[PDB]
């Protein structure tokens, strides 16, 4: 199919069909059907690595959504590029002030 | 009903194959995929609106416009790899 020809894991034929149905502009270059798919796989792969190490931190083989929140909230860049989304099963990272605790 | 469940499982096995999943995480990752895609496409279209236009370069420059350079360099490299593989 399209994945073997492109040599990429995430399907791009369906993604390119969705982009064509989008019709965002008159000139839609079809030569890169997997560019957005490539960037999303890279982002999701680094997110998955962060979530995996977070889950292995607390002897949790299965990724609890709290681990996902911790993974997406422990990095300055990740919170900078999006910080206005409230994920299900919340809970901010632990914090304390120099005045509340001795 | 073409979802990304198979692709998500593939990327799971690629990154952390030993790690399992929940029953609602896949919805979160699918939302990440498609919402990032549509917002990036909308920014690309609004950028191309001014210039007369009636591909890889547009997507790459849209990525470099707003998305951080730390990720933008990797995005450009992987996009070049993908387009070369497609042309191969």
């Amino acid at each position: 199919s399209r994945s073997a020809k492109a040599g990429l894991t995430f399907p791009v034929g369906r993604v390119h069909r969705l982009l064509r149905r989008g019709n965002y502009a008159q000139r839609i270059g079809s030569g890169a059907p997997v560019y957005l798919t490539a960037v999303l796989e890279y982002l999701a792969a680094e997110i998955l690595e962060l979530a995996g190490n977070a889950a292995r931190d607390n002897k949790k083989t299965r990724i609890i959504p709290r681990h996902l929140q911790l993974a997406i909230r422990n990095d300055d860049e990740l919170n900078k590029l999006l910080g206005n989304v409230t994920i299900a099963q919340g809970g901010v990272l632990p914090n304390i002030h120099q005045n509340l605790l001795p | 009903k073409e979802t990304y469940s198979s692709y998500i499982y593939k990327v799971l096995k690629q990154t952390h194959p030993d790690t399992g999943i929940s029953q609602k995480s896949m919805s979160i990752l699918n939302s990440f995929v498609n919402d990032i895609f549509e917002r990036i496409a909308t920014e690309a279209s609004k950028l191309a609106a001014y210039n007369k236009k009636s591909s890889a370069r547009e997507i790459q420059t849209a990525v470099r416009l707003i998305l951080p350079g730390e990720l933008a360099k990797h995005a450009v490299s992987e996009g070049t790899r993908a387009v070369t593989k497609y042309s191969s």
């Binding site: 422990n74 990095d75 300055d76 860049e77 | 350079g69 730390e70 360099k73």
Partner: peptide, 9 residues
Amino acid sequence: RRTSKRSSV
């Protein structure tokens, strides 16, 4: 920016 805090963390 090549690495910054991408690998140490």
